[PDB]
Amino acid sequence: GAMERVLKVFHYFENSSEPTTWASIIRHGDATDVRGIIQKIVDCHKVKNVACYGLRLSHLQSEEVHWLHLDMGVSNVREKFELAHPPEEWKYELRIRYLPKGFLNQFTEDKPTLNFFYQQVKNDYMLEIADQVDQEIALKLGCLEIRRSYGEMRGNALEKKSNYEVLEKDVGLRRFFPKSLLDSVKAKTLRKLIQQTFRQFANLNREESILKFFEILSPVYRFDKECFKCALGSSWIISVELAIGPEEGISYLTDKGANPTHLADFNQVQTIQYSNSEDKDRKGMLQLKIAGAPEPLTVTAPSLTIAENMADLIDGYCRLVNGATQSFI
Amino acid sequence: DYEIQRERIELGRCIGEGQFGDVHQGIYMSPENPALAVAIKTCKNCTSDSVREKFLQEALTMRQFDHPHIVKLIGVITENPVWIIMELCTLGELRSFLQVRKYSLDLASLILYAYQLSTALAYLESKRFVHRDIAARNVLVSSNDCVKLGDFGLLPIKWMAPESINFRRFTSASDVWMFGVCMWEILMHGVKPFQGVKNNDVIGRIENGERLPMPPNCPPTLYSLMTKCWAYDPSRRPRFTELKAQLSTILEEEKLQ
Ligand SMILES: CN[C@@H]1C[C@H]2O[C@@](C)([C@@H]1OC)n1c3ccccc3c3c4c(c5c6c(n2c5c31)CCCC6)C(=O)NC4
């Protein structure tokens, strides 16, 4: 390596400041690769479920996402993407990606991870679906974040004017609610609405807020799996939507929402390979060898990147469901 | 430049515990004139860029302040182990000062400290700086007739404004809240607010309109002044600048026999 420079690693560990600037500054003195990065950050917050974390590197003016292999070096990852577009244009982001066979009730015994998964999922929701979600769902969730964030106030503190005033004037309600929720109705009505729908969640501790936050979020937001338009077969090729998740392993969708067809679980995987598909075109092959089955499970993805992502994903789950630190690619 | 050569500092006895590292008393051979008596703040986790970055900040903010009742920053030794050299308040912590001298200190002196404290705090608001922990235990005594505010680094539930407990907001107005408790501690001769009261109850009591009693022998105008600092609604509390002038006539009143 040449420079040598900073690398700001944006994370979802709560730091009582501003969730946009939650990041670890990881200087030259650590580590040498990616499995390095993660281990430094997770250990600061004494994480149990280390298997579940991954590093995402995305350009902040495009939607394409790059999951970084565990062993791929620090400098040579930087020196394949970063060095083409002025370095201050990439977002390094630590994320939970590989979920256990019952994540909520497991993250429970691991405070640091539960808050992390909460924050991450909360941020997706606030960034993607909060504005065209059913508005009282938006109400229930924001109140729940208030209830969580300020664990020390009695459940009827917002009843007092000066307390609501603190949330409205100083911290800003946009921190809990989507722009549309606040602009839709009069401010005095907004005040009454918040206090009232708060009444049902007034009594809950931090965990219970989080759990009910998920409970209320799950029937309207996908966060328990990832889905991929792709193809299957090594000669005859069929378009399918792939669901990859803890509760149905690797499955396909048709479409939707018929009981998804389970293909393979994560313990049944042996190897993972990916190519530039040649043939030709910049598409990506993916090939899974599965215990018992003779011919491998081929997957044709629209781009190389998508396969490199699908790989990381099954790669991540194979590691977790086994007990391995060595990848399966 | 506030940089000091370690040769010119003799480290002495230890005098406090912060949460970066111990506070020491020492000697500083300036060529200014003779051997100055300093307090030396030290750091335990010097072997890390992050801790140092912040530890040094304390010194770097303190630079911006120059005031008769805020401990001066004399300088910094920026090499491991990092030290912040500042002036020694020889007569020590206010609580211990008052306790020892319960029956030898007049009301006027007590009101004097409160006032000096408020010049400090008014000074700081004029600089937009929020203390976050005004309390007797953070006040050092330089002389009989002179106290100074110390710190300045980033839970004291019994001292905190409701909004600091509820929503973790710290402002000038929360400062004024803590200053009130502080005057109370002074006027009670370093006796802690809510002794025998669990933190979690204290929060409820205050929530219910309850306040600290009027300390015996405290003069009513002043206790009236403290109660204003404990308005629940932050906007109803006086600014430090008005406390200052209030405390001034209150003192001149007591002094004027
Ligand atoms: C009971 N409170 C402690 C008393 C002690 O040590 C602390 C940790 C605390 O004083 C604010 N301390 C500081 C903490 C952070 C920045 C500056 C100081 C500080 C300072 C002093 C000091 C003293 C004592 N303590 C001092 C100081 C006790 C004995 C007399 C002097 C001091 O004299 N100048 C800065």
- DSSP conformation class of A52: G
Question: Residues with Cβ < 8 Å from A186, sequence gap 6 or more?
Answer: none
Chain B residues within 8 A of A170 when measuring between CB atoms: 167, 169
Say how far apart CA A9 and CA A41 lie, in whole Å. 9
Strand partners, B37: B27
3-state DSSP assignment of residue A23: strand
Contact between residue A146 and residue A158 where contact means Cβ atoms under 8 Å apart: yes
Q: Which of A30, A11, A31 is nearest to A21 (CA)?
A: A11
What six digits make up the tokens of A314? Answer: 């099954």
Task: Write down the H helix ranges in A129-226.
Answer: 135-149, 161-165, 179-184, 187-198, 206-217
Residue B41 · residue B76 · CB < 8 Å: no
Residue B197: which residues within 8 A CB-CB, separation 6 or more? B158, B205
Locate the ligand 1 atom nearest the alpha carbon of residue B152 and give its number: 16
Decide if B133 is catalytic. Answer: yes
Domain A99-222, what fold? Answer: Acyl-CoA Binding Protein (1.20.80)
Q: Are B44 and B135 in contact (CB under 8 A)?
A: no
- Name the region of A114 (left: φ>0; alpha: ψ -120 to 50; beta: rest): alpha
Q: A154 — contact with chain B (CB < 8 Å)?
A: yes
Asked if residue A240 lies in contact with residue A230, where contact means CB atoms within 8 angstroms, the answer is yes
Å resolution of this model?
A: 2.8
Whether B169 sits inside 8 A of A171 (CB atoms) is yes
Contact between chains at A154 and B207 (C-beta distance less than 8 A): yes
Task: Answer whether B186's CB lies under 8 Å from B118's CB.
Answer: no
* Cα–Cα distance, A163 to A150 (Å, whole number): 12
Residue intervals of chain A classified under CATH 3.10.20.90 are 1-98
Strand partners, B73: B86
Q: At what angle do helices B220-229 and B172-187 cross, to 10 degrees?
A: 150
Contact present, A252 and A260 (Cβ < 8 Å)? yes
Task: Give A135: exposed, middle or buried? Use CB within 10 Å, 0-12, 13-18, 19+.
Answer: middle
Per the CB < 8 A criterion, the answer to whether A60 and A91 are in contact is yes
Query: Looking at beta carbons, which residues of chain A come within 8 Å of B233?
Result: 161-162
Which of these, B85, B146, B204, lies nearest to A156 by C-alpha position?
Answer: B204
First-last CA distance in chain B:
48
Q: Where in chain A is the domain with CATH 1.20.80.10?
A: 99-222
Domain boundaries A223-329, corresponding CATH code: 2.30.29.30
Joined together, the tokens standing for residue A287 give 């090939």
For residue B18, give the ligand 1 atom closest to its CA. 8
Instruction: Please give the distance of CA A69 from its chain centroid, rounded to a whole number.
Output: 16
Distance, in Å, from the CA atom of A7 to the CA atom of A13, rounded to the nearest integer, reads 17
**CB contact (8 A) between residue B204 and residue A152:** no
Give the separation between CA B245 and CA B167, rounded to whole angstroms.
31
Q: Residue A165 CB: number of other CB atoms within 10 A?
A: 16
Q: Which amino acid is at A227?
A: C
Distance, CA of A87 to CA of A6 (rounded, Å)? 10
From A154, A161, A167, residue closest to B167, measured CB to CB: A167
SS3 label, residue A281: coil
Q: Topology of A1-98 in CATH?
A: Ubiquitin-like (UB roll) (3.10.20)
- What is the secondary structure of B47-68 as a DSSP string? SSHHHHHHHHHHHHHHHT---T
Domains and CATH numbers, chain B: 1-88 (3.30.200.20), 89-255 (1.10.510.10)
Q: How was this structure determined?
A: X-ray
For A67-86, b/e burial (b = at least 16 CB within 10 A) is bbbbeebbbebbeeebeeee
- Which three-class secondary structure state does DSSP give residue A326? coil
Contact between B247 and B114 under an 8 Å Cβ cutoff? The reply is: yes
B212 DSSP 8-state letter: P
Distance CA B201, CA B207 (A): 10
